[PDB]
């Protein structure tokens, strides 16, 4: 299932794949998860994250 993303918290490479640590809109921080970049439909957040780090 797809869910609204509040913000990208962190980025990493694991097993050769880029993953983003996500805060989910309306869910607590305890539910943050690492998601492979192809799970994301968050062009604006990704571009903003990759621009500010």
């Amino acid at each position: 299932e797809e869910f609204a993303v509040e913000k990208i918290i962190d980025r990493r490479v694991r097993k050769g794949m880029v993953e983003y640590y996500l805060k989910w809109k309306g869910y607590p921080e305890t539910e943050n998860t690492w998601e492979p970049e192809n799970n994301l439909d968050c062009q604006d957040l990704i571009q903003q994250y990759e621009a500010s780090r």
């Binding site: 993303v5 989910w24 968050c42």
Partner: peptide
């Protein structure tokens, strides 16, 4: 602004 959750 969405993502698949695993």
């Amino acid at each position: 602004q969405t993502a698949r959750k695993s």
